[PDB]
Amino acid sequence: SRKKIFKPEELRQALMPTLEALYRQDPESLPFRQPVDPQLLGIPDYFDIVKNPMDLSTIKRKLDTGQYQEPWQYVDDVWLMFNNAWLYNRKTSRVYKFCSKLAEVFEQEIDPVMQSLGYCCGRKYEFSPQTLCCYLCTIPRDAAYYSYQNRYHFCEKCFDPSQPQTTEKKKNDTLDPEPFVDCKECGRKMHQICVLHYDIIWPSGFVCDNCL
């Protein structure tokens, strides 16, 4: 019940250096300094594919007017901008490779900064894809396979006992967001894998090290 409230200036002063570190990159930040403009750039299908645009100058504006209540909302907007560019642009394009550079930079900046706002780290996604099971046989990362509605999986060399059975293609290269658990006292979202350990149990709810 002693919830942590971040004031705008606390967030701005801590996080703006991670944004400036992206803005610094030349030429890699140049497609990202201003909102995507589909008529000017002559890409009329952009908003058919990208439903929620995001860019460095919008993120800076939101930090400047205190529209972030807690720092993961900022991290989410950054990854939104990256994921928009990776989706819209082809793997071989300049814009895409620029995006992967900005991402590398951010992942190296964000952890100390999130730790100074009291968090475990600042990494949004899992390190590794989840080993999928082949319907004893399992599928490693990046391995190719066939799927149906996310449910049943088969390795390409193959392709509940009481449930009456009935009778596309992908690659296992996707990272899920790293799941969270809330501090019972301050309300901070921490990563389960960062703060929960095989030998500790939390009968009355997780409490982070700042609140202990």
Ligand SMILES: CC(=O)N1CCc2c(c(-c3cccc4cc(-c5cnn(C)c5)ncc34)nn2C2CCOCC2)C1
């Ligand atoms: C971020 C995103 O998803 N966008 C969507 C696609 C896009 C963007 C930019 C773009 C916008 C503003 C500045 C840019 C600057 C450079 C640049 C500057 N120096 N260097 C070596 C490259 N490149 C692309 C830019 N173009 N396109 C393509 C337009 C069609 O034609 C091929 C490129 C934005």
Ligand SMILES: [Zn+2]
């Ligand atoms: Zn963490």
Ligand SMILES: [Zn+2]
């Ligand atoms: Zn198999």
Ligand SMILES: [Zn+2]
């Ligand atoms: Zn706490």
